[PDB]
């Protein structure tokens, strides 16, 4: 039974200038996360860039 770690998803829309964080999802690897994000968040729109990043790769500033 595979691991399904957490991924953060960032999208830059067609006419958009920068990638904006739009949510999270669990996926077995980066390619499945991309595929899922494409469906869940972009609905397969042409011209949209998607970035996926495993959560563990993000270091946040301290409140």
């Amino acid at each position: 039974k595979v691991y399904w770690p957490l991924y953060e998803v960032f999208v830059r829309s067609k006419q958009g200038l920068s990638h904006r964080h739009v949510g999270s999802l669990h996926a077995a690897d980066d390619q499945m996360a991309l595929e899922n994000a494409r469906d869940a968040y972009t609905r397969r729109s042409e011209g949209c860039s998607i970035w996926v990043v495993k959560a563990s790769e993000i270091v946040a500033s301290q409140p």
Binding site: K1, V2, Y3, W4, L6, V22, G23, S24, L25, H26, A28, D29, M32, N36, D39, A40, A55, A60, S61, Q62, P63
Partner: protein, 302 residues
Amino acid sequence: STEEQRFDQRIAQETAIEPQDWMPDAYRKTLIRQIGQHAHSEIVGMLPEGNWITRAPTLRRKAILLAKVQDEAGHGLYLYSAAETLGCAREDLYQKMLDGQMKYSSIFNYPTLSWADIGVIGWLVDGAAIVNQVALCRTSYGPYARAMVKICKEESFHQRQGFEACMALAQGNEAQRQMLQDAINRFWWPALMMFGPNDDNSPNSARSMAWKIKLHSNDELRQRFVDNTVPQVEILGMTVPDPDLQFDEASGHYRFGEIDWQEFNEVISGRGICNHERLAAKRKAWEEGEWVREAALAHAQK
């Protein structure tokens, strides 16, 4: 403590709580509870409507239902992400759901016995969901509030589509009109129960209201649903299965009958019409799918 006081002050000033901010452990846990069970609901909620995907009477209505069930799955994922910001694991809370240690919405334990039930769910069930969720767009925890904003945009479309399916029956043959009324008669009270127990039978409300998780009381939201929805029932030329429903000109509200609280407690405790079947289906999907998940992991590793 200074931690506790700072938090109470941040709540009072309506500053969004974020995953890295300090929060009372009871606040963290009640949100894992609530967001997790909200997410569970999106998943189990696929099943009553999904029951009719292969049987939907036209290709257009079938395509709408497929999109809606797909949207629900996506809403589940959004909610699992939000719950994880609180430090829980999707897989663990899902497992608690399967074992019956976390709840999902009472509404999904009711069977779809006709095509009309599908339009009625889109209309009343998504209707009740939307009232609740719009009220949560100012919930105090940021990830949750932003999940509600993302979701209500998509969901109000599908609620409209379900009402339009209801209108087709309401304007159709006598058999279609009757189908609609029967579906309403069966789903009306279940939809009202989605708002939760009464305000003095609500364990949770004290903390949730104080910590601004809940912005309006169960009874407040339910009244607003009744007020907004009664005129939609009228538009369909239909009735409400409530002999005690009447407009009170004085208050400006619809006054409505007492919920069967004994049924509601049966349902949330696993003894409703479809509770066993719903959890069985989800357990069966999980177990039978194990080899696929293991395959995906073994392939990823290579």
